[PDB]
């Protein structure tokens, strides 16, 4: 006759969060403007004002992406969710999907495509590698894929993919080009239209400096027809593009209620898109390039090595560093956070326990932080147990 569970003791305490300087593959630290937005009040999830805020965000995504695609919007989910929204709406069960599996992401793409019943063909490759225009034709010819997936910035390996020539190829094969720019957006050159990408998506917590939880996505006219001419209903409802497109003002139809968008998070995505708009896409590109260079020399000076041997393949936003000869990589990471309040990750997926990952994202991609982390790494090398 009573209540099984009583108020949780811990909840009766006040929320207290440590001070952390995040310099890993993400998320990144939030700027005062973004933090301020996140502290504002609610408004109608379907009020004229949300729509404006929503239309402003669309414009921002078209800016950072460099596209005019009417079908551009925010996915109410993390980067992963944007990937599924793309795969589940584009691939019909049995569509033969070509995947560039050179990191954990392509593998994530395979796993998803497999789950949605697509004939998936993985183009494997050890971590650190990228894909030639050549290696892809073989795949395209051997499997006549309807969709091809490519990771622009492998935050998993530190590799940066060249995207040039793929329009060419993909059209020469009637294949849609899907690119992941969660880790590259804002840190290296990218142009949807110019580069012929049919589906582009990115996260909000990387170089954009917004809190995790939302992601950006854009579909070309080509991608559209597919999605809109499908005879099968995509397995997902939450991510159905016809519903999503309409609510975000991409149709000719009035805005229908689908799901309630994350209002507070949109405030912050705005601001973060207005911030990068103030810099200028190209200045942002210099920052990360220049910062990434500084970091590289500084790191090589400490005696460390760069996993990615080719400087032109090095992802500015995320740098992979081979794990030093006699150290337990776990000690180095813990030593950095325990003594410097700084985050740096180890590897992820194929790169697990093979490297350390240091990120330079948005307002954080600075010489200042390159120094701060450079010195935290020294101490760790000096004081961590060595075989």
Curated annotation (Swiss-Prot):
Q: Which residues carry this modification: Phosphothreonine?
A: 6
Catalyzed reactions per annotation: L-serine + pyruvate = 3-hydroxypyruvate + L-alanine; glyoxylate + L-alanine = glycine + pyruvate
What is the pH dependence? Answer: Optimum pH is 7.5- 8.5.
User: What are the entry keywords?
Assistant: Acetylation, Aminotransferase, Disease variant, Peroxisome, Phosphoprotein, Pyridoxal phosphate, Transferase
Q: Which GO terms describe its cellular component?
A: cytosol; intracellular membrane-bounded organelle; peroxisomal matrix; peroxisome
> Where found, per UniProt?
Peroxisome
Consequence when changing residue 180 to N: In HP1; loss of alanine--glyoxylate aminotransferase activity; no loss of dimerization; no effect on protein stability
| InterPro entries for the chain | Aminotrans_V_dom, Aminotrans_V_PyrdxlP_BS, PyrdxlP-dep_Trfase, PyrdxlP-dep_Trfase_major, PyrdxlP-dep_Trfase_small, SP_NH2Trfase/AEP_transaminase
What EC number(s) does its UniProt record assign?
2.6.1.44, 2.6.1.51
What does this protein need as cofactor? pyridoxal 5'-phosphate
- Say where the protein is mainly found: other
As recorded in UniProt, coiled-coil segments are none
Please describe, based on the UniProt annotation, the reported consequence of changing residue 170 to Y. In HP1; loss of alanine--glyoxylate aminotransferase activity; loss of dimerization; decreased protein stability; causes protein aggregation
What disease association does UniProt give? Hyperoxaluria primary 1: An inborn error of glyoxylate metabolism characterized by increased excretion of oxalate and glycolate, and progressive tissue accumulation of insoluble calcium oxalate. Affected individuals are at risk for nephrolithiasis, nephrocalcinosis and early onset end-stage renal disease.
| Family to which the UniProt record says this protein belongs | Belongs to the class-V pyridoxal-phosphate-dependent aminotransferase family.
What name does UniProt use for this protein? Alanine--glyoxylate aminotransferase
Origin species: Homo sapiens
Q: What is the lineage of its organism?
A: Eukaryota, Metazoa, Chordata, Craniata, Vertebrata
